[PDB]
């Protein structure tokens, strides 16, 4: 289920990679860098980003989401949800 990750930025950023699907099927955490603030905050590769700093970002573009992340200098809180099950 969705969960909040509280990140404090380091000198090399947060240490995660955000990957977008053709608009606007969502933004996902592709990679979490070892030893990074993202790893410390327990963000996980595969996570879908649901909120940034308390605002729902489902249906926003990659740029909108990145801008929200950058909006507050030095910290961000990401509500994310992993996906373990799909019926295809």
Shortest CB 35 distance to Cl ion, Å: 19
Q: Residue 11 or 87: which CB sits closer to Cl ion?
A: 87
Shortest CB 23 distance to Cl ion, Å: 21
Q: Give, in degrees to the nearest 5, the angle at Cα 27 between 17 and 57.
A: 125
Give residues 57-86 in contact with Cl ion (rule: CB under 5 A): 82-83
Neighbours of 28 (CB within 10 A): 17
Neighbours of 84 (CB within 10 A): 5
Shortest CB 48 distance to Cl ion, Å: 8
CB 47 within 8 A of CB 82: yes
Q: Residue 3 or 24: which CB sits closer to Cl ion?
A: 3
- Provide the binding-site residues for Cl ion, judged by CB under 5 A: 44, 46, 82-83
């Amino acid at each position: 289920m969705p969960r909040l990750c509280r990140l404090v930025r380091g000198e090399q950023g947060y240490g995660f990679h955000l990957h977008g699907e053709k608009g606007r099927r969502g933004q996902f955490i592709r990679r979490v860098e070892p030893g990074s603030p993202a790893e410390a905050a327990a963000l996980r590769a595969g996570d879908r980003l649901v909120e940034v700093n308390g605002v729902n970002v489902e249906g926003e573009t990659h740029h909108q989401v990145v801008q929200r992340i950058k909006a507050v200098e030095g910290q961000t809180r990401l509500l994310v949800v992993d996906q373990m099950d799909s019926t295809l």
